[PDB]
Amino acid sequence: FNAPFDVGIKLSGAQYQQHGRAL
């Protein structure tokens, strides 16, 4: 419950922080 970074998004090639589909 704390992912301020993406240096460990387990791939998640999709986005970086998955803001939630928005621009």
Side-chain angles (χ1 to χ4, degrees):
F1 271 81
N2 200 45
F5 247 100
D6 157 85
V7 182
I9 194 90
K10 267 126 189 102
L11 243 167
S12 265
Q15 212 98 92
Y16 42 87
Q17 279 179 63
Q18 190 200 293
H19 253 221
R21 253 151 243 274
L23 301 128

